[PDB]
Amino acid sequence: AYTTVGSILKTWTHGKLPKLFKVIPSLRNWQDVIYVTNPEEWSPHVVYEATKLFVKESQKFINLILLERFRDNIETSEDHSLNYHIYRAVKKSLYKPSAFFKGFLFPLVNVREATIAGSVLAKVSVPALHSSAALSYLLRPTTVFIKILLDKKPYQTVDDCVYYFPVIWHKAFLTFAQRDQRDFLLETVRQPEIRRELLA
Amino acid sequence: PEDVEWFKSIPLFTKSGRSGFIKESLGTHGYFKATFDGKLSAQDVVAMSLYKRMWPMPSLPWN
RNA sequence: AGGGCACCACCAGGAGUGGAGCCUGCGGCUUAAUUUGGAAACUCACCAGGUCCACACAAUAAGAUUGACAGAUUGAGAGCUCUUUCUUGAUUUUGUGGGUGGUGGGCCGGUUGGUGGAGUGAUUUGUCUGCUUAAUUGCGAUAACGAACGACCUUAACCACUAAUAGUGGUGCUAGCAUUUGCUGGUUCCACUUCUUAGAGGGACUAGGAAGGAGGGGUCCCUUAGACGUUCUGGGCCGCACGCGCGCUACACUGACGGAGCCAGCGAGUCUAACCUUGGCCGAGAGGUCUUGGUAAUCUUGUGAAACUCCGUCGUGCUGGGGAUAGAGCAUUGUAAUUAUUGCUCUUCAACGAGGAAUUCCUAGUAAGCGCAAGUCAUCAGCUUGCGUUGAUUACGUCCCUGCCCUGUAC
Numbered sequence: 001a002y003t004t005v006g007s008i009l010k011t012w013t014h015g016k017l018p019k020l021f022k023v024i025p026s027l028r029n030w031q032d033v034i035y036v037t038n039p040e041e042w043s044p045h046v047v048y049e050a051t052k053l054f055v056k057e058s059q060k061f062i063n064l065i066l067l068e069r070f071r072d073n074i075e076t077s078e079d080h081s082l083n084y085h086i087y088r089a090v091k092k093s094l095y096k097p098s099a100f101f102k103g104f105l106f107p108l109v110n111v112r113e114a115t116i117a118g119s120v121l122a123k124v125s126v127p128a129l130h131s132s133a134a135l136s137y138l139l140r141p142t143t144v145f146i147k148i149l150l151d152k153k154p155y156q157t158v159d160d161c162v163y164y165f166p167v168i169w170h171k172a173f174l175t176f177a178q179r180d181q182r183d184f185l186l187e188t189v190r191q192p193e194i195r196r197e198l199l200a
Numbered sequence: 201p202e203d204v205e206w207f208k209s210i211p212l213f214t215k216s217g218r219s220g221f222i223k224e225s226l227g228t229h230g231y232f233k234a235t236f237d238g239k240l241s242a243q244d245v246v247a248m249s250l251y252k253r254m255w256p257m258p259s260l261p262w263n
Numbered sequence: 264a265g266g267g268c269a270c271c272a273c274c275a276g277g278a279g280u281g282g283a284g285c286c287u288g289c290g291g292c293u294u295a296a297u298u299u300g301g302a303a304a305c306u307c308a309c310c311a312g313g314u315c316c317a318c319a320c321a322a323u324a325a326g327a328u329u330g331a332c333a334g335a336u337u338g339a340g341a342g343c344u345c346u347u348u349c350u351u352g353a354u355u356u357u358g359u360g361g362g363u364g365g366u367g368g369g370c371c372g373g374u375u376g377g378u379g380g381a382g383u384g385a386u387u388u389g390u391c392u393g394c395u396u397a398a399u400u401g402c403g404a405u406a407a408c409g410a411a412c413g414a415c416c417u418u419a420a421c422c423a424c425u426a427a428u429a430g431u432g433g434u435g436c437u438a439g440c441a442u443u444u445g446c447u448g449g450u451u452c453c454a455c456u457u458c459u460u461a462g463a464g465g466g467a468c469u470a471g472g473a474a475g476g477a478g479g480g481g482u483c484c485c486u487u488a489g490a491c492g493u494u495c496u497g498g499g500c501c502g503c504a505c506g507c508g509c510g511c512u513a514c515a516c517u518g519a520c521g522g523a524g525c526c527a528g529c530g531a532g533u534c535u536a537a538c539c540u541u542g543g544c545c546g547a548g549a550g551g552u553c554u555u556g557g558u559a560a561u562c563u564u565g566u567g568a569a570a571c572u573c574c575g576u577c578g579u580g581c582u583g584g585g586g587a588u589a590g591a592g593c594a595u596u597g598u599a600a601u602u603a604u605u606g607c608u609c610u611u612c613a614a615c616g617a618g619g620a621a622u623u624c625c626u627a628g629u630a631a632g633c634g635c636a637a638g639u640c641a642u643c644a645g646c647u648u649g650c651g652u653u654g655a656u657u658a659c660g661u662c663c664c665u666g667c668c669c670u671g672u673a674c
Contacts, residue, residue, distance in 0.1 A: 052330085080365090082365070084492080085493090096354085119364090125353095227311090228295060242368090242486085243368065243484095
């Protein structure tokens with residue numbers, strides 16, 4: 001019967017939120033009990049209010065609600081740009097990096113949606129052990145995230161990158177120049193700033 | 201606003217060379233609204249110039 | 264210059280508008296703002312006042328930092344601030360150096376050639392002397408012959424076939440009146456399809472007749488710390504000497520008021536939950552309250568609409584015409600009705616006596632009179648679209664006015 005309060009919580013655009021919205025994470029059935037309130041009908045401000053309150057099931061919540069709202073805002077918004085509170089929720093979310101990559105990083109794999117996701121994912125640091133795992137999993141326009149993950153500056157990572165041999169793809173490879181199969185890469189480029197810079 | 205009104209009759213120009221005029225004061229912080237020959241944009245700047253007479257100084261012999 | 268066409272042109276006329284009160288759109292004025300060109304919050308874009316929030320160098324930390332009971336601070340407040348003090352771990356903090364960009368300034372909505380003839384050429388013929396049409400729509404003629412875009416599809420109206428949630432008749436039971444055995448009704452089955460229905464099939468070619476039709480040009484540079492922000496409370500968009508325009512209500516007897524009679528068509532409706540609401544009860548009224556049918560040809564709903572018809576009062580007096588402005592009280596929607604959403608009751612009783620110069624629409628189920636449904640929508644219409652009810656006068660023409668179209672000269 002708590003949905004009788006949730007039907008009002010959809011307007012909680014300012015001030016103190018209802019107590020039912022603050023205590024919900026304490027219940028082990030919340031993965032089903034949250035379906036009765038259905039915050040995806042709620043105002044965007046609650047999405048950030050929830051994203052600060054939901055912080056391994058956070059990947060299931062981050063993938064089950066956060067990624068669902070992110071697609072609806074970017075796809076439904078009249079300018080294609082996410083709402084400020086949606087963006088603030090995503091950039092404020094991902095406080096555990098595996099929840100971001102496992103929740104949205106891989107499942108999010110048009111090009112405009114990829115660009116907006118990167119503009120948040122480049123806005124904060126990430127652990128070296130976390131960043132290397134994402135670069136390997138990406139080694140399987142999705143390279144626009146690879147170009148972003150390469151912009152932050154292991155032997156298995158170098159071995160996965162060597163197999164990676166539009167102007168955004170050339171420039172992303174050009175950034176890889178910042179650091180016998182290297183003869184094959186030069187043979188591919190011979191098929192010039194990278195051929196000269198590849199001589200270093 | 202009292203300043204905005206006092207100068208109202210002086211013409212305005214953009215550094216992109218367009219010309220315009222004050223309509224009226226808006227609000228209390230000295231905003232005003234104006235009209236121009238064509239489509240301005242946020243990269244433009246609006247200016248007005250004021251002039252004063254200069255007179256020559258005298259001179260002295262030297263050694 | 265001729266010639267042709269059109270009630271966004273006229274002629275013959277109808278209803279008017281322009282004059283009064285009020286509603287509403289624009290301009291101007293005023294103001295802190297009256298944003299820009301079916302607004303009480305939000306919408307919102309405007310005004311007054313408040314919170315809150317990159318990258319690259321030097322210092323810092325195992326405690327950089329993150330989250331949270333109960334209470335609190337302002338005109339506007341909260342575990343991002345504060346009293347109390349837990350939880351947590353490198354996700355990062357303070358100065359100093361260029362900013363780069365979820366940042367500004369890729370895609371759409373009546374018209375000519377071939378081959379042949381003439382000329383040094385640009386041109387020309389074909390595309391014509393004569394006769395036809397809305398039209399390059401056609402006879403004929405003959406240095407031409409043969410070719411290319413623009414200009415079929417649904418209504419009205421008659422009939423076989425469907426089906427029933429629509430209708431008729433009969434049958435059983437039954438009420439009243441009258442008593443040849445009738446007439447007007449109520450409530451269990453049966454037959455039918457004419458009326459209705461809706462879907463499907465067929466039904467003018469210039470031939471008297473349903474009908475000699477109606478409709479489908481736009482979307483490289485600069486600038487960046489709280490930066491072309493986030494959010495809360497209150498106000499405005501409705502202010503009015505005035506100018507221009509679309510409208511509503513009237514100036515009464517071809518009427519106002521009272522009682523009685525009494526008839527439509529097109530719509531729209533809830534379980535996602537609370538929409539359209541019958542019936543009973545209370546109240547002068549607005550309205551309230553207990554139940555009920557309908558996800559609909561089935562229920563609201565025969566939407567028992569208004570004008571209209573009949574019988575009375577009034578007697579030509581700004582009158583019992585007209586109802587602006589204003590006072591007091593009772594309800595309903597909403598978080599909130601003050602500058603006042605809307606409804607009801609009593610009181611107040613303004614201009615207006617058929618409107619100058621100008622000016623709009625209109626040829627038959629049409630103009631005009633009258634009302635209803637839908638849209639928007641918590642509430643709020645004098646608005647827009649559609650539907651039905653009652654139903655005229657005057658042409659069946661022309662180029663006078665307004666406007667459009669077609670067919671001497673190097674300008």
